[PDB]
DNA sequence: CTGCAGGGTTTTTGTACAGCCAGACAGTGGAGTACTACCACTGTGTAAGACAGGCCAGATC
C-alpha cells in the first residue's frame, strides 16, 4: 500500500535527497 | 461489518564513515558608528442664545 505521502513544505533535507536524486543527476549529466 | 495483530508496502530520520570550507571566536585602538535623551515648544478645540433693565413708541381711554 504505502503511507499517506508527503505534502512538500514539511521536511528537512534527506527525504529531499531521493525525492530529487535522479533529476539532480540528469542535471549533472546536462 | 467491526475489533486488533503478524507482516507487507514506501518512506522517513538518523547514524554511520572521511575530507573541508565558512564564519564565529578573541584582540585591538579606536575608529566613526548608531541610537539616546534633552530642549522648548506646538496643534486640535471658534458662535449662538438668555436675561436684565432701560425707555421710547404708540395704541387704548
Curated annotation (Swiss-Prot):
In the adult, predominantly expressed in the thymus with lower levels in the pronephros, mesonephros and ovary. It is found in: Nucleus. It comes from the Eukaryota. The RING-type zinc finger mediates the E3 ubiquitin-protein ligase activity. The NBD (nonamer binding) DNA-binding domain mediates the specific binding to the nonamer RSS motif by forming a tightly interwoven homodimer that binds and synapses 2 nonamer elements, with each NBD making contact with both DNA molecules. Each RSS is composed of well-conserved heptamer (consensus 5'-CACAGTG-3') and nonamer (consensus 5'-ACAAAAACC-3') sequences separated by a spacer of either 12 bp or 23 bp. Homodimer. Component of the RAG complex composed of core components rag1 and rag2. Belongs to the RAG1 family. Catalytic component of the RAG complex, a multiprotein complex that mediates the DNA cleavage phase during V(D)J recombination. V(D)J recombination assembles a diverse repertoire of immunoglobulin and T-cell receptor genes in developing B and T lymphocytes through rearrangement of different V (variable), in some cases D (diversity), and J (joining) gene segments. In the RAG complex, RAG1 mediates the DNA-binding to the conserved recombination signal sequences (RSS) and catalyzes the DNA cleavage activities by introducing a double-strand break between the RSS and the adjacent coding segment. This is V(D)J recombination-activating protein 1. It comes from Danio rerio. The chain holds residues 408 to 437 of 1057 of the full protein.
